[PDB]
Homo-oligomer: A and B are copies of this chain.
Amino acid sequence: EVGISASTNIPGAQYPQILSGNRVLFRIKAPDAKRVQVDLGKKYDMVREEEGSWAITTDPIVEGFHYYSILIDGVAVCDPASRTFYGMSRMASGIEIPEEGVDYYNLKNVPHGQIRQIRYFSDVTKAWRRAFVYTPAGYDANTSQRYPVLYLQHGGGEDETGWPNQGKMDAIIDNLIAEGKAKPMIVVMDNGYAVDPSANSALEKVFINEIIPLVDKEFRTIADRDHRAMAGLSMGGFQAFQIAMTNLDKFAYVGGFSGGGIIGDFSKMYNNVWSDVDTFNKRVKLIYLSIGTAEPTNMYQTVNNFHKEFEKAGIKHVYYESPGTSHEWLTWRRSLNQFAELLFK
């Protein structure tokens, strides 16, 4: 009958509510609509209730974060009751379905780092750009301390606000550091779209010639490959491998979360970076690949086949299959939690 308002609700909005069994109760006032649906997992038709309102209770929804839409007369729009997130190439509603007994991505009373917005003009794209830079707890007070850096990228249809919002990255990293499971580190989150209008080679040039120099001159970093990592989800995973594998002198740790390498002579990929497997293994401290067990087959296969080629070649790596999750943010929160614990050790 009555549940708990989702944590993604706008302040003051009672609905949607999460009921027992993780069913979700949606309501909306729409007296003149012909049809009202909610698309969460599948599409559900709402039914008319009192005072022009419509409502529906869904089937159980899998735990985690989900983009969703309300459909008015078949038009997919943001639910006025929920926060929005930049995903699926627009501002989309999202809903959080809590995991029982899991709290690593939740806020805790531990020392907190700070996410900073840094603006810069790109001479590659000829546009103003923006990075978000997480500094770990104590950064401002520990002026003699220098830190390793993780460059962390969002997926297709997302932007630089993804990891701070959908990814809950500050809680994940703050909590790992506070528990002694990860080293204090700076995390840099930029935009995976870069078009050079004078012509992804453009994104690589932005990272190598603009973002890395910006972070290394504005923050107290340990500016060497043994203290520099790159990872991303989906498209950002393909970009992390493209950029790191063609700039291996700058990175010793690389991660792809539901993304990474499009596979011919696999031994020649990235300009012969791993033509000699034993030498490549000596140069890289970590290669990490993950995928949800419930991802769409085409997305699962691309990443799994990359892993399979690494296994065949003897390229050392960590491979994680996230049980019960799909091409959605819980898979990526779990991946960051695992990956960050392995970094800079």
A interface residues with partner B (beta carbon < 8 Å): 10-12, 28-35, 70, 72-78, 80-84, 89-91, 107, 109, 112, 114-119, 121, 128, 140, 143, 159, 164, 170, 193, 218-219
- Which among A73, A75, A89, A219 has the greatest number of chain B C-beta atoms within 10 A? A75
- Scoring A11, A76, A117 by chain B CB atoms within 10 A of each residue's CB, the highest score goes to A117
Residues of B within 8 A of A12 (CB): 89
* Interface contact B80-A10, CB-CB below 8 Å: no
Contact pick for A73, options B73, B76, B218, CB 8 Å: B73
Q: A195 to chain B: closest CB distance in Å?
A: 8
Interface of A, secondary structure class, is loop
- Nearest chain B residue, comparing its CB with the CB of A220: B140
For A80, the chain B residues whose CB sits under 8 A away are: 75-77, 90-91
B107-A78 in contact (CB<8A): no
Copies of this chain, tallied across the complex:
2
Asked if B77 and A78 sit within 8 Å, CB to CB, the answer is yes
Task: Show 16 residue pairs from A and B whose CB-CB distance is below 8 angstroms, ordered by the A residue.
Answer: A30-B73, A33-B72, A33-B74, A34-B73, A72-B72, A73-B73, A77-B77, A77-B78, A78-B78, A78-B91, A114-B117, A114-B118, A115-B117, A116-B117, A117-B164, A140-B218
A90: chain B residues at CB < 8 Å are 10, 80-81
Check B89–A84 contact: CB distance below 8 A.
Answer: no
Q: Is the CB of B119 within 8 A of A112?
A: yes
| Chain B residues near A118 (CB-CB < 8 A) | 112, 114
Give CA–CA (A48, B28) in the complex, Å. 25
Instruction: Please state if A28 and B107 are interface contacts (CB–CB under 8 Å).
Output: no
- Point out the residues of chain B lying under 8 angstroms from A219, CB to CB: 140
